Write an enzyme that holds these catalytic residues in place. Structure first.
Site, PDB file in Angstrom:
ATOM      1  N   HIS A  40       0.821  -1.210   0.000  1.00  0.00           N
ATOM      2  CA  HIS A  40       0.000   0.000   0.000  1.00  0.00           C
ATOM      3  C   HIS A  40       0.851   1.255   0.000  1.00  0.00           C
ATOM      4  O   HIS A  40       0.294   2.342  -0.216  1.00  0.00           O
ATOM      5  CB  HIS A  40      -1.067   0.005   1.103  1.00  0.00           C
ATOM      6  CG  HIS A  40      -0.637   0.457   2.412  1.00  0.00           C
ATOM      7  ND1 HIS A  40      -0.320  -0.347   3.454  1.00  0.00           N
ATOM      8  CD2 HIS A  40      -0.552   1.728   2.882  1.00  0.00           C
ATOM      9  CE1 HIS A  40      -0.028   0.386   4.523  1.00  0.00           C
ATOM     10  NE2 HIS A  40      -0.137   1.655   4.195  1.00  0.00           N
ATOM     11  N   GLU A  52      19.168   7.419   8.251  1.00  0.00           N
ATOM     12  CA  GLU A  52      18.498   8.532   8.833  1.00  0.00           C
ATOM     13  C   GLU A  52      18.265   8.418  10.296  1.00  0.00           C
ATOM     14  O   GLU A  52      17.975   7.336  10.825  1.00  0.00           O
ATOM     15  CB  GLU A  52      17.125   8.765   8.155  1.00  0.00           C
ATOM     16  CG  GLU A  52      17.209   9.328   6.769  1.00  0.00           C
ATOM     17  CD  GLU A  52      17.465  10.800   6.730  1.00  0.00           C
ATOM     18  OE1 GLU A  52      17.949  11.342   7.744  1.00  0.00           O
ATOM     19  OE2 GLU A  52      17.184  11.434   5.675  1.00  0.00           O
ATOM     20  N   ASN A  54      17.293  12.055  12.245  1.00  0.00           N
ATOM     21  CA  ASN A  54      16.465  13.212  12.062  1.00  0.00           C
ATOM     22  C   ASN A  54      16.199  13.386  10.564  1.00  0.00           C
ATOM     23  O   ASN A  54      17.129  13.676   9.794  1.00  0.00           O
ATOM     24  CB  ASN A  54      17.142  14.428  12.648  1.00  0.00           C
ATOM     25  CG  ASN A  54      16.245  15.665  12.594  1.00  0.00           C
ATOM     26  OD1 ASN A  54      15.480  15.848  11.665  1.00  0.00           O
ATOM     27  ND2 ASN A  54      16.367  16.500  13.593  1.00  0.00           N
ATOM     28  N   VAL A  57      17.062  17.058   8.892  1.00  0.00           N
ATOM     29  CA  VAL A  57      18.393  17.655   8.967  1.00  0.00           C
ATOM     30  C   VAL A  57      19.405  16.665   8.427  1.00  0.00           C
ATOM     31  O   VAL A  57      19.365  15.494   8.804  1.00  0.00           O
ATOM     32  CB  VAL A  57      18.752  18.027  10.422  1.00  0.00           C
ATOM     33  CG1 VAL A  57      20.208  18.523  10.529  1.00  0.00           C
ATOM     34  CG2 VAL A  57      17.718  19.030  10.941  1.00  0.00           C
ATOM     35  N   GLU A  59      22.681  15.013   8.653  1.00  0.00           N
ATOM     36  CA  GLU A  59      23.602  14.786   9.798  1.00  0.00           C
ATOM     37  C   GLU A  59      24.925  14.172   9.365  1.00  0.00           C
ATOM     38  O   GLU A  59      25.867  14.252  10.073  1.00  0.00           O
ATOM     39  CB  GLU A  59      22.812  13.947  10.889  1.00  0.00           C
ATOM     40  CG  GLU A  59      21.577  14.677  11.487  1.00  0.00           C
ATOM     41  CD  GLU A  59      20.888  14.000  12.679  1.00  0.00           C
ATOM     42  OE1 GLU A  59      20.213  12.944  12.472  1.00  0.00           O
ATOM     43  OE2 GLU A  59      20.864  14.583  13.802  1.00  0.00           O
ATOM     44  N   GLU A  62      23.564   9.818   5.925  1.00  0.00           N
ATOM     45  CA  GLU A  62      22.518   9.467   5.008  1.00  0.00           C
ATOM     46  C   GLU A  62      23.009   8.988   3.687  1.00  0.00           C
ATOM     47  O   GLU A  62      24.016   9.482   3.129  1.00  0.00           O
ATOM     48  CB  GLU A  62      21.661  10.730   4.717  1.00  0.00           C
ATOM     49  CG  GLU A  62      20.947  11.317   5.899  1.00  0.00           C
ATOM     50  CD  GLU A  62      21.724  12.347   6.702  1.00  0.00           C
ATOM     51  OE1 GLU A  62      22.958  12.549   6.498  1.00  0.00           O
ATOM     52  OE2 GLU A  62      21.073  12.941   7.574  1.00  0.00           O
ATOM     53  N   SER A 177       3.723   2.908   8.234  1.00  0.00           N
ATOM     54  CA  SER A 177       3.399   1.884   7.251  1.00  0.00           C
ATOM     55  C   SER A 177       4.591   1.506   6.424  1.00  0.00           C
ATOM     56  O   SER A 177       5.338   2.377   5.981  1.00  0.00           O
ATOM     57  CB  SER A 177       2.320   2.409   6.298  1.00  0.00           C
ATOM     58  OG  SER A 177       1.113   2.570   6.961  1.00  0.00           O
ATOM     59  N   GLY A 178       4.750   0.221   6.185  1.00  0.00           N
ATOM     60  CA  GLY A 178       5.886  -0.307   5.435  1.00  0.00           C
ATOM     61  C   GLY A 178       7.074  -0.628   6.294  1.00  0.00           C
ATOM     62  O   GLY A 178       7.981  -1.362   5.813  1.00  0.00           O
TER      63      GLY A 178
HETATM   64 CA   LIG Z   1      18.938  13.275   8.425  1.00  0.00          CA
END
Ligand SMILES: [Ca+2]
Ligand SMILES: N=C(N)c1ccc(/N=N/Nc2ccc(C(=N)N)cc2)cc1
Length: 224
Positions: A40, A52, A54, A57, A59, A62, A177-178
């Site tokens: 879905h 990730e 935050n 932002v 950091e 990522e 979800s997921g």
């Molecule tokens: Ca981040």
């Protein structure tokens, strides 16, 4: 996640954010190039955000990688949410490190009463909506099939199980979800649906990942 706590930063290195302008769903990294999520959560274009904490932002840990293939289970029913699972193949592999890494697929189903970890950047309110910046976590137990069925009579298919608290107060929610339900180091569930969030007798409903391990294997092999 309603009634949870902020996770330790990058302590769930398998947790991903699906982004299409904004965060809209979670997922779980199962290999360098493949993610499990809910059918879905399908969109025709998805950016996967790994490493990730935050989500607002940058950091320094990522990795943003576009989905190259977005493959829903062919028996997904968009009315009942039967077979609510999908695979995403990343356009390039993720770099696996302390902060980005994989979660094992399950070797057996989880027993009722097993304590699990549910996570995501979804709504934190039982009435209305507020979305957090930092990843949230929730410790919750697997419920019995009878409890699941009594909570949602006529709505629990053979692909679904429940995790949470029948008294309410703690649950997953919209935009979780997921995302993952991990029990004893294995991915056992995908956040799928519920009625409201954190309401009495309305626990979360999750896809039984164990039922799809062979499908995952086969689908990956065919799309490699
Ligand atoms: Ca981040
Ligand atoms: N919307 N998606 C969604 C996800 C999970 C729940 C829940 N666990 N109550 C409800 C709704």
């Amino acid at each position: 996640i309603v009634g949870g706590y902020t996770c330790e930063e990058n302590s769930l290195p398998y947790q991903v954010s699906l982004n299409s302008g904004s965060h809209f769903c979670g997922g779980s990294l199962i290999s360098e190039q493949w993610v499990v999520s809910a059918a879905h959560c399908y969109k025709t274009r998805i950016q996967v955000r790994l490493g990730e904490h935050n989500i607002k932002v940058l950091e320094g840990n990522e990795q943003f990688i576009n989905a190259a293939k977005i493959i829903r289970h062919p028996k997904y029913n968009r009315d009942t949410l039967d077979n609510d699972i999908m695979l995403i193949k990343l356009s390039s592999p993720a770099v696996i490190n302390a902060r980005v890494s994989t979660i094992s697929l399950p070797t057996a189903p989880p027993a009722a009463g097993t304590e699990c970890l549910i996570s995501g950047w979804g709504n934190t309110l039982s009435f209305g909506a507020d979305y957090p910046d930092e990843l949230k976590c929730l410790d919750a137990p697997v419920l019995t099939q009878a409890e699941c069925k009594a909570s949602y009579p006529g709505k629990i298919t053979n692909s679904m199980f429940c995790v949470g608290f029948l008294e309410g107060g703690k649950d997953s929610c919209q935009r979780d979800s997921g995302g993952p339900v991990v029990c004893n180091g294995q991915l056992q569930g995908v956040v799928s649906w519920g009625h409201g969030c954190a309401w009495k007798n309305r626990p979360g409903v999750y896809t039984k990942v164990y039922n799809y391990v062979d499908w995952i294997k086969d689908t990956i092999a065919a799309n490699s």
